Symmetry: C2
Subunit: 311 residues, 2 copies
């Protein structure tokens, strides 16, 4: 309802100016990675909207020439006080781009620099359907639906209705495996992550979480499609792989990579979205729900690992 209405307000306001033609997602840290699904969505699905995903520091120092009245800028900062992101919202407003801000803190400094503010669920036992990543995706879904039309809108809303129950089931499902993982890798100071597709940002965040636990070296988050092109970590006989096995249209890319790692006898912890019940969401939209699945299941593993030893 909320994001739908916000986008309707924007489509109405910008109509006389030639409408919305460009979407920018601008954030730092976890908030940047959490916008990756929205970027993947508009790249896959749009024919008449551009999409850009920027780090806030890059955006404010090097804004695109298309920033103006035919752009919408979506910013995110959990506490609403990330300075570069506040400056991004400000520069957007000065160029006449409507700004949607995503934040947990509704009286934070960010909110003064946004045209529209949306919040999200957060913390233990949140409703996933309303989490930050989902609100970012809904901005994209609505902007597409309300400008060009989106053929899989109903399928998408069906996915939104399902993701919470899928995630809480999945967290229960993995409890046992998480304990064994913790035992197997509690002494591994470096672990690579592997992923592809619209959920890649969740794997990147997991590579950060591993670094934070192990406090040694921040290692590559490898794209599945790079095995034996640019990704020669497979020649690394020491370092294990934490493998995000997606559901949807890049699953075959992941499967090829996983088969390679298996053929080399590497140590792999596989987290499989298909094994965890994501496939009740329709094939037309499931790519976009990988992030929400993995980003909310990995804490089970990370907590177990910790015990064995900017959002």
């Amino acid at each position: 309802m909320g994001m739908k209405e916000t986008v309707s307000n924007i489509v109405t306001s910008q109509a006389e100016k030639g409408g919305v033609k460009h979407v920018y997602y601008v954030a730092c840290g976890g908030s940047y990675a959490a916008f990756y699904p929205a970027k993947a969505f508009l790249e896959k699905e749009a024919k008449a909207l551009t999409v850009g995903l920027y780090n806030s520091g890059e955006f404010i120092n090097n804004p695109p020439v298309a920033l103006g009245e035919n752009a919408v800028v979506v910013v995110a900062s959990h506490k609403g006080n990330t300075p570069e992101t506040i400056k991004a919202a400000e520069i957007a407003r000065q160029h006449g781009a409507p700004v949607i801000g995503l934040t947990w803190i509704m009286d934070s400094p960010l909110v003064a620099h946004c045209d529209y503010v949306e919040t999200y669920t957060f913390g233990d036992g949140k409703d996933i359907a309303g989490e930050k990543t989902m609100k970012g995706l809904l901005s994209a879904v609505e902007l597409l639906q309300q400008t060009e039309g989106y053929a899989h809108y109903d399928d998408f809303q069906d996915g939104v209705s399902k993701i919470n129950r899928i995630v809480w089931r999945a967290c229960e499902q993995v409890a046992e495996r998480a304990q064994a993982f913790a035992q197997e890798y509690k002494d591994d100071k470096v672990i690579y992550t592997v992923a592809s597709g619209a959920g890649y940002g969740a794997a990147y965040l997991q590579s950060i979480c591993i670094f934070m636990e192990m406090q040694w070296i921040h290692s590559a988050c490898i794209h599945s499609g790079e095995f034996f092109h640019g990704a020669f970590e497979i020649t690394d006989a020491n370092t294990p792989f934490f493998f995000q096995f997606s559901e949807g249209n890049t699953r075959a890319v992941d499967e090829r990579a996983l088969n390679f790692l298996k053929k080399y006898g590497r140590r792999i912890e596989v987290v499989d979205a298909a094994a965890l019940g994501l496939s009740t969401i329709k094939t037309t939209v499931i790519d976009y729900f990988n992030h929400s699945l993995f980003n909310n299941v990995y804490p089970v593993y990370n907590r177990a690992l910790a015990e064995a030893r900017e959002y």
Copy 2:
């Protein structure tokens, strides 16, 4: 003039279909990183072209709905044999998108699935104005100029006319420093790289070069803007720092100041110190990649030598 007649041919053929509206750069390995400047160029400069940079495997398994007669696909494979990339050209042609192929081998399997084939300079002694990265960039520059117009076209071409000289002079300039670097880091198992902006792909490729030399861990290629938002550990890892010229120099300078303040071990390669600044500030961002990608081998050779002694280009 790399790409100009090819792009003219495409802009002519597609006009009746509604024109070129979408550009896709599709590759694996080195060739993917080499297209990052073209992606950054169209993101900054275009108002009516979309740009997408894809890994070939992702592209063939999950092609965008805009892949059709209003798209152009630029694929690259050095030897012209990369199966996923060949398949990407094939799927593009099935959807009616013109395909430009970049390869060094002009009778390779790739060529049979491209509408247009372009090559590039390669090997020691290469002319940077013609190198693969520069061909990628000129595809973007020419696609922009011939569809919407590009305000800084002449400045860009002036940069092209300067970059070979800049690069080869810089390689000589850093020779002594590369020897000292090699002695200082010959026993370092892991080295982070740091960069931002249109030259980020060169830093990413350098992270692979370091991993291949040291054969320990492939460490993060850290974006300069993400040090304030994602830590110094006991490992005391050193940094190979790419200090750009142009619009993200201020982002890099913030990170550099932080590393300096905590007394980290840093090897700085600074585009302004290496002569890049004769290129106009309107276009200089786009020449960082070509500079660093061609200067780092000086450091990497020296490191290999100091230690006694696969990747798709």
